[PDB]
Design a protein around this nucleic acid. Sequence first.
DNA 1: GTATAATGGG
Length: 179
Amino acid sequence: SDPVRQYLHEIGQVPLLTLEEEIDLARKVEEGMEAIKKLSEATGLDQELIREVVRAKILGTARIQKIPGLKEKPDPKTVEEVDGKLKSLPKELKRYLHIAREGEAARQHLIEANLRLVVSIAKKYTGRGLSFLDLIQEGNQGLIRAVEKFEYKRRFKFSTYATWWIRQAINRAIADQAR
DNA sequence: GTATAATGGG
Ligand SMILES: [K+]
Ligand SMILES: [K+]
Ligand SMILES: [K+]
């Protein structure tokens, strides 16, 4: 497939993370999630809503843009409104917004650096009801779930935890396609 | 709650 070949081409340019970059990114993601909790408490808005909007603002400096199976940006009207409430917060709370920005910049980076992993697991599940693209989308959503639950303090490699999640996602999608 | 590492494959 032409869009697929192009996708594989694009993700292949993304270098693998060292262990040290991995921990740094994972740390920034934790920190970003605690910051967004503080912003939620202070504004009364949904944590995931804040996260999505902050994320929408960091995608400008992203390397891979249309990632298959990833949730789409909210509608710009909601971005503008929520972004407005955040920018307008008090001095003390604007450092939390900075931390949340790096957290979401780091999430995106960490995700891009492991798209190659999903593809390789995907390859083991072809001919089972779902196209390759479909496998990648289901795999990608496992990846995202892994970034959310990964605990770097455990000292296990990200690929270890990510792989578990990616298989779960792919195994569930096959069993649902099959009634 | 799900955790060896795994990102061409074995
Ligand atoms: K070789
Ligand atoms: K070779
Ligand atoms: K070899």
